[PDB]
Write a protein that binds this ligand. Structure first.
Ligand SMILES: CC(=O)NCCCCNc1ncnc2c1ncn2[C@@H]1O[C@H](CN(CCCNC(=O)Nc2ccc(C(C)(C)C)cc2)C(C)C)[C@@H](O)[C@H]1O
Length: 331
């Protein structure tokens, strides 16, 4: 029983891999996970990168010499820390590049069958990363991913931001079950790298349920990939969003209200009356399964829109303007 071992840079339990090195799917195997782990820990620790400076991934001797060189380097770094040199971070967030590796790693050891996840740590990572950069979140924010799958988007945001809490709600059995493993693996691997994450919870359930009505209402930042949602589900969501607090934000792949929404007495009930909607900057060179560049939509709860409309009704000048417009429009 041959093995390959990688020591943790912060003294956690070693990562152990059986030889021959397992294959996860067509584009991921343990060999490259080992190589990627080594070189990301080198990015973590400059002295390590400085010492390390990796040939045949199908030779045991070649791979073992790679792991040995890494582990011996780690030992020297730990001795270096016992001296006058200050130890590593231990409370920092992972860089975007490292976080991508970690999530991929977590996915590799959680989802043993990527084939029964038949939908439509994927390469939405960069999309979500762009949103994390643009949508500012603080420690008073509550984050929710509506329909969170195996939970990778929640994990990514939780690793990146300092929201008070992050939630993922998932309805189906299989992804919710995998999410339990994703959760356990994530906490383990983040510790292995010595990286911090904000609080998060991956739950089972339906976000249309009566329980989630109040929960949505109290959420300050919602991510929902709703592009392929039918009109009934989207309508139900609009009803939920209507109870959100001022300044509450919804980021989605399909708008919940029109961008050029003009309020009148025919659309007084519509969600557009209480939110600003903008199309966010797309990420250069993206493209989705439809072959089009990905666009995102930011909704911000703002009830001054409605307030100002009601004020305008009290103004006789504005009133004539509105009423003359309506009659002209009906043509
Ligand atoms: C056709 C259809 O889906 N109808 C829905 C039925 C209504 C029931 N409501 C639901 N309640 C709870 N969970 C349900 C219900 N609907 C379905 N899910 C689950 O969503 C999961 C899929 N998710 C994605 C999972 C991973 N998370 C993400 O990709 N998140 C994410 C969010 C936002 C973005 C951007 C930044 C682009 C806006 C990007 C990614 C959907 C929403 C695309 C599946 O596992 C579904 O089981």
């Amino acid at each position: 029983k041959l093995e390959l071992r990688l020591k943790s840079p912060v003294g956690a339990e070693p990562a152990v891999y059986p030889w021959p090195l397992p294959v996860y799917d067509k584009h991921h195997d343990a060999a490259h996970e080992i190589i990627e782990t080594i070189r990301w820990v080198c990015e973590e620790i400059p002295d390590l990168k400085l010492a390390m400076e990796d040939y045949d991934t199908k030779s045991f001797e070649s791979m073992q010499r790679l792991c040995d060189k890494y582990n011996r380097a780690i030992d020297s770094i730990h001795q270096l820390w016992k001296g006058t040199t200050q130890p590593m971070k231990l409370n920092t967030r992972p860089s975007t590049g490292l976080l991508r590796h970690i999530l991929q790693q977590v996915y590799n050891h959680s989802v043993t069958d990527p084939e029964k996840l038949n939908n439509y740590g994927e390469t939405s990572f960069d999309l979500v990363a762009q949103m994390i950069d643009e949508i500012k979140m603080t420690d008073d924010d509550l984050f929710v991913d509506l329909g969170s799958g195996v939970g990778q988007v929640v994990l990514q945001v939780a690793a990146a931001t300092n929201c008070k809490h992050h939630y993922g709600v998932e309805k189906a059995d299989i992804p919710a079950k995998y999410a339990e493993t994703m959760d356990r693996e994530f906490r383990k691997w983040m510790k292995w790298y010595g990286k911090k994450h904000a609080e998060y919870t991956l739950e089972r359930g339906d976000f249309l349920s009566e329980e989630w009505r109040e929960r949505i209402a109290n959420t300050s930042v919602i991510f929902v990939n709703n592009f392929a949602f039918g009109p009934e589900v989207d309508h139900q969501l609009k009803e939920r969003f209507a109870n959100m607090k001022e300044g509450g934000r919804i980021v989605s792949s399909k708008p919940f209200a029109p961008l050029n929404f003009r309020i009148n007495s025919r659309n007084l009930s519509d969600i557009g009356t209480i939110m600003r909607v903008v199309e966010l900057s797309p990420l250069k060179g993206s493209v989705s399964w439809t072959g089009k560049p990905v666009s995102y939509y930011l909704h911000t709860i703002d009830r001054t829109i409605l307030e100002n409309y009601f004020s305008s009704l009290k103004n006789p000048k504005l009133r004539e303007e509105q009423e003359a417009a309506r009659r002209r429009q009906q043509r």
